[PDB]
Amino acid sequence: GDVTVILNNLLEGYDNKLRPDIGVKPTLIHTDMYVNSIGPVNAINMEYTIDIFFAQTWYDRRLKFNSTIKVLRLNSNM
Amino acid sequence: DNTTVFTRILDRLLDGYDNRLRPGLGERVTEVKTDIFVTSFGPVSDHDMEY
Hints:
This is part of a larger assembly, with chains A and B. Chain A is an alpha+beta fold. Chain A contains one helix and four strands. A two-stranded antiparallel ribbon of chain A has the order 1-4. The longest helix of chain A has 8 residues, at 3-10. By secondary structure, chain B is an all-alpha fold. Chain B: This is Gamma-aminobutyric acid receptor subunit alpha-1.
């Protein structure tokens, strides 16, 4: 419907090689995790397996829209 | 020459399709009806506690 229009308007004039505020200020990224399982700690290789759900949240003033929908929920296609 | 009419059908289907939006984004909850056919239960590795 109109969500396609929003997604198309967000990607018109968008350069995904430049971080948000490339020449203004550093980008503050909030990182969270969820350690599912810490695998076997084998001493022979001095290593250990871990399985996590790494979540990163940041602010991007270019992906800013104004419509009735508050949040856009998307898969790995975008 | 059904190839041409089926090509036109497919191109009408995909014309204006957004694969980033689930079916019924506004007024429905998608119902994914799953199913499994286990062709072969592989060897249950006891060392790794996997299967």
